Amino acid sequence: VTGATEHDTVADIVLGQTGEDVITISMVEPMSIAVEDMYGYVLDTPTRDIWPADEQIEQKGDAVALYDTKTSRALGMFNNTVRIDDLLSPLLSLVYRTYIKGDTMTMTQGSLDHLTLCAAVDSDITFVGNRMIAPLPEGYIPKPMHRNNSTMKMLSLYVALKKLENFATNSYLMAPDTSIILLGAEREPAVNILRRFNRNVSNVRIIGMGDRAVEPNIRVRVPFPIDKNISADFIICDINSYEDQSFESMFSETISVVTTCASAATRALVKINHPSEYMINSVIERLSQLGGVFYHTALLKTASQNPYSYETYIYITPIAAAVRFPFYSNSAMINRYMTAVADDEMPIIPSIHTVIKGHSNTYSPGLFCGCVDVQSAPLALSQLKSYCSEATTWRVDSDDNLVNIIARIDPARIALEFRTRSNTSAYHEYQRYVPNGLGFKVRKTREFRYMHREVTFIHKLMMYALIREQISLTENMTQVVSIGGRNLADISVVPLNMKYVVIDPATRIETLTQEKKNIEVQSRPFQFDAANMDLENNSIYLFIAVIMNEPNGAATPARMQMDKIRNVATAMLTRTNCVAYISFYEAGIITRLDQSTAHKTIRVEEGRLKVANYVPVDTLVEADVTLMLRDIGITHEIIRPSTPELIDACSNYGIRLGSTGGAVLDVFNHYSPVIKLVR
Amino acid sequence: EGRLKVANYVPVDTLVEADVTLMLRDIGITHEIIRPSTPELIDACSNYGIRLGSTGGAVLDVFNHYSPVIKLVR
Numbered sequence: 001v002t003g004a005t006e007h008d009t010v011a012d013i014v015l016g017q018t019g020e021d022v023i024t025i026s027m028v029e030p031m032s033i034a035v036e037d038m039y040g041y042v043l044d045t046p047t048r049d050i051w052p053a054d055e056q057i058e059q060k061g062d063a064v065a066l067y068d069t070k071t072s073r074a075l076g077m078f079n080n081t082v083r084i085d086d087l088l089s090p091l092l093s094l095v096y097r098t099y100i101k102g103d104t105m106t107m108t109q110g111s112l113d114h115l116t117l118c119a120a121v122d123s124d125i126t127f128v129g130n131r132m133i134a135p136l137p138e139g140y141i142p143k144p145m146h147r148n149n150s151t152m153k154m155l156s157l158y159v160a161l162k163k164l165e166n167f168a169t170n171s172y173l174m175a176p177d178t179s180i181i182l183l184g185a186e187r188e189p190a191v192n193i194l195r196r197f198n199r200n201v202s203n204v205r206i207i208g209m210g211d212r213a214v215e216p217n218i219r220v221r222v223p224f225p226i227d228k229n230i231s232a233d234f235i236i237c238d239i240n241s242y243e244d245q246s247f248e249s250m251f252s253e254t255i256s257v258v259t260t261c262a263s264a265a266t267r268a269l270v271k272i273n274h275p276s277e278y279m280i281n282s283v284i285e286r287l288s289q290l291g292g293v294f295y296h297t298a299l300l301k302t303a304s305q306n307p308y309s310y311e312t313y314i315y316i317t318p319i320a321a322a323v324r325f326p327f328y329s330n331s332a333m334i335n336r337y338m339t340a341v342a343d344d345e346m347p348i349i350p351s352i353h354t355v356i357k358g359h360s361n362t363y364s365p366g367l368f369c370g371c372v373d374v375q376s377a378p379l380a381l382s383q384l385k386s387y388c389s390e391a392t393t394w395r396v397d398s399d400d401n402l403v404n405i406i407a408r409i410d411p412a413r414i415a416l417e418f419r420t421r422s423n424t425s426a427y428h429e430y431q432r433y434v435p436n437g438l439g440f441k442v443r444k445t446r447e448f449r450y451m452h453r454e455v456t457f458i459h460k461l462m463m464y465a466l467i468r469e470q471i472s473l474t475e476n477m478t479q480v481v482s483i484g485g486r487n488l489a490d491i492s493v494v495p496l497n498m499k500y501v502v503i504d505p506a507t508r509i510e511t512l513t514q515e516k517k518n519i520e521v522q523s524r525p526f527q528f529d530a531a532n533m534d535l536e537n538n539s540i541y542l543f544i545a546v547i548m549n550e551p552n553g554a555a556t557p558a559r560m561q562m563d564k565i566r567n568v569a570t571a572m573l574t575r576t577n578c579v580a581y582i583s584f585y586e587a588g589i590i591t592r593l594d595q596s597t598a599h600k601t602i603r604v605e606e607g608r609l610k611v612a613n614y615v616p617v618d619t620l621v622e623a624d625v626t627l628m629l630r631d632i633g634i635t636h637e638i639i640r641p642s643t644p645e646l647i648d649a650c651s652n653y654g655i656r657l658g659s660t661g662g663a664v665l666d667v668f669n670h671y672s673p674v675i676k677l678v679r
Numbered sequence: 680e681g682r683l684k685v686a687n688y689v690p691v692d693t694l695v696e697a698d699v700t701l702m703l704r705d706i707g708i709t710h711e712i713i714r715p716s717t718p719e720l721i722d723a724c725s726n727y728g729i730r731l732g733s734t735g736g737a738v739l740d741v742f743n744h745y746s747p748v749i750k751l752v753r
C-alpha cells in the first residue's frame with residue numbers, strides 16, 4: 001500500500017488492447033477436486049414440536065409473497081452462469097482419456113472410482129480379477145458417456161440413499177434389492193450408468209418412470225394410474241414445474257408427489273422446487289395421515305448440485321416411534337430461499353478496466369487487462385496498487401517492447417486505501433525491474449472473471465458484508481476497535497471517515513505506514529477483566545473468531561468462551577453508545593456433520609469443530625448464551641449472513657462458489673451466528 | 680451413586696441452587712430462599728416433647744442448609 005515514493009497529480013496510464021492470442025478471458029473457472037468428493041451430502045434436521053395456527057398463516061403469507069415476486073435476479077444470474085456439468089467436466093474427461101489409453105488398474109469393485117468410471121465411458125467394464133480392470137480389447141474405442149447436467153447429482157443421490165442405511169459402507173451395490181428413479185427422464189443417462197454399475201449383482205431391477213420418458217424408461221404421470229401397482233426399495237424423485245401455475249397448483253402437485261413416493265418405497269428422496277417453511281411443514285403434516293405410520297424426515301442437499309440452487313431434497317422413511325420434533329423453523333437450508341428476495345438494483349456485471357487512474361474511486365469490481373510499454377510498467381504497477389493487491393506482469397518476447405498486465409480489483413485494498421489523501425508506493429523498487437525483471441511467457445494466458453476461493457473465505461466475506469451493512473446503518477460513532485483483527489482483515493467494513501484500532505498481540509509494527517492510513521495498533525493482549533476493560537463510551541468493538549481460541553494458538557473450552565462473553569457484556573454496561581459484535585460456532589452443527597459425508601475441510605474431531613486446519617474448538621449452545629445475556633440485562637441479538645450477503649460477496653469479489661462448497665455453506669452460515677450487543 | 684437415600688425411600692437426585700435461582704429470574708416472579716434456623720429447632724423440640732440425639736445433632740446442621748424452601752410470592 002505504502003512506500004518511499006511520493007506521488008501527486010500524476011498522469012493516468014492507458015493500457016493498450018491485447019490480442020486474443022495472448023490473453024483470453026473466460027467466465028467461470030473450472031474447479032479441481034478429488035474424484036471421491038463429487039458424491040457428498042449434508043443433513044438438516046427438524047427442531048420444533050408444534051405448528052400453531054398463527055405460525056401457519058404467517059408462513060403461508062411469507063411463502064406466497066415470494067412466489068409472485070420471483071427469486072432475486074442476481075441469484076438467478078449466478079445460478080445459471082455456474083452450472084454443475086461444466087464445473088466438473090474436465091475431471092470426467094481426464095478419467096475417460098486415462099481409461100482409453102490403458103492406464104486404469106487396481107480399483108475396488110464398488111468404490112466411488114468405479115462409479116465415476118461407469119459415468120465416464122459408455123462400454124461395459126469387466127474385472128479380469130477382483131480389484132483390477134481388464135485391458136480393453138485391441139481396436140476398441142468406446143464413445144464417452146454423454147450425460148446431461150443433472151446426472152452426477154443423481155449419482156450422488158443414489159450414493160446418499162445407499163449410505164444412509166449403513167454409514168460405514170465402502171461399497172454401493174444393491175443385491176438383491178430394487179430401485180426406481182421417479183423423473184420425467186427424456187433421455188436418462190443415470191439409469192444406464194447404474195445398470196452398468198450393478199451388473200455383477202445377481203438381480204437388481206432399476207428403471208426410471210416419468211412424464212416424458214423414452215426407452216427403456218416408462219412414460220407415466222404421477223400419481224400413478226389406479227389400475228397399476230408400483231413398488232420398490234428406493235425412490236429418487238425430482239419433478240419440475242416447466243409450465244407456470246399458481247401457488248395452489250404446485251402445492252397440490254408436490255403434496256401428491258410426496259404422498260405417492262412415501263407410499264411407494266421404504267426410503268425416498270424427493271426434490272422440493274420451492275422449499276418454504278409452510279410447504280415443508282405441510283408436507284410433514286401430510287406425512288402423518290398416511291395410514292397412521294410414523295415417518296422420519298431430514299432435509300438434505302448433495303455436493304454434486306448447482307452451488308447457488310435453493311432447491312433442497314427431502315428424505316422420507318418410516319420410523320418405529322414418532323419423532324418428538326417433526327417440524328422445521330429457521331433451518332439452514334430454507335433460509336437460502338427465504339432470503340432470496342428480489343433486488344432493488346440490477347445485477348452488476350464485472351467489467352474490464354483499461355485505464356489506470358491516480359487515486360480515483362470510479363472503479364467497479366473487475367479486472368485490469370491490457371498491455372503497456374516496458375518503461376511505463378513500473379509506473380502503472382505503482383499506480384494500480386491503490387485498487388489491487390496482486391498483479392501478474394509478463395512479456396511475450398525479449399524482442400517485444402510491450403508488457404501484459406492482469407490485476408483484479410480487491411475491495412479490501414480499496415477500503416485500506418483511500419482512508420487519507422497521501423499517495424505513496426514502492427516505485428523506487430519497481431524501477432529495478434526494467435527491462436528484464438518482468439517475466440516471459442509465450443504460451444497463451446487463461447484468466448477467469450469468477451475465480452475460486454474456499455468455503456471459509458466465502459463465509460468470512462458474507463459476514464463482513466453483513467457487519468458492514470449493520471455498521472453503516474448506525475450513526476454518531478467515533479471508532480471501530482477490531483480486537484480479533486490480524487493483518488487488517490476486518491478493514492473491509494469500517495467507513496473511510498472514521499478511525500479503526502487493532503488490539504492484537506501478534507501483528508506487525510510499522511508506525512509510519514500506520515500513521516499514513518489513520519490506523520492505530522496495540523500489540524498488547526485484550527484482557528477480559530471487567531475491572532480493567534478499556535471500552536470507550538462511543539465506539540464499536542469487533543470480536544471475530546477470537547473468543548473461540550487463545551492468542552498463543554490453543555483452544556478454549558466452552559465455559560471459558562461464555563465467561564469471556566459475560567465479561568465483555570458486563571463491562572460494556574455503564575456506557576452511552578457502545579456496540580459489540582461476537583461470533584461463535586454453535587452446537588447444532590455437530591449433529592449435522594456427524595451424519596453427513598460432504599465434510600471436506602470443515603470437519604468434526606472428538607466433538608470439536610475442526611475448521612480449516614485450525615486447532616479443534618468446541619461449540620456453544622444458543623439457549624445458554626441467550627439466557628446469560630437475558631440475565632445480564634443488555635439488548636442482545638442473533639444475526640446471521642443471508643443470501644444477499646452471499647451475492648454481494650461473490651459479486652464485489654470476483655469469486656464463485658464451488659461444487660462441494662455449495663452444500664456445506666447453507667449449514668455452516670446458520671451455525672456461526674453473530675451477537676449484536678448495543679446500548 | 681450420587682443420590683440422596685433418606686428414610687429408606689428410593690434415592691432421588693439433587694438440584695443446583697444457581698440453576699433454580701437463574702430460572703426464576705428469567706421467568707419474572709419474586710422469589711426467595713428460606714431456611715429453618717435455631718429457633719425453629721427449639722420450637723420443634725419444645726412444643727413437641729422431643730430432643731436431638733447424638734448421631735442426629737451433627738448431621739442436622741448439614742440437613743437444614745441443603746433442604747431449602749423457595750418462597751414465591753406475588
Ligand SMILES: C[S@@+](CC[C@H](N)C(=O)[O-])C[C@H]1O[C@@H](n2cnc3c(N)ncnc32)[C@H](O)[C@@H]1O
Nearest residue numbers: 150183184185186210211212221222238239240
Ligand atoms: C428436471 S425435468 C427432467 C430433466 C432430465 N430428464 C433429468 O434427468 O433431470 C423433470 C421432469 O419431470 C416430469 N414431470 C413434470 N411434472 C410431472 C408430474 N406431475 N408427474 C410426473 N412427471 C412430471 C417432466 O416431464 C420433466 O421432464
Ligand SMILES: C[S@@+](CC[C@H](N)C(=O)[O-])C[C@H]1O[C@@H](n2cnc3c(N)ncnc32)[C@H](O)[C@@H]1O
Nearest residue numbers: 483484485486489503504506526544545550551
Ligand atoms: C482465528 S484468527 C481471526 C482473524 C480475524 N479476527 C477474522 O476476521 O477472522 C484469531 C486471531 O486473534 C488473535 N487473538 C487471539 N486471542 C486474542 C485476544 N484475546 N485479544 C486480541 N487478539 C487475540 C490471535 O493471534 C489469532 O491469530
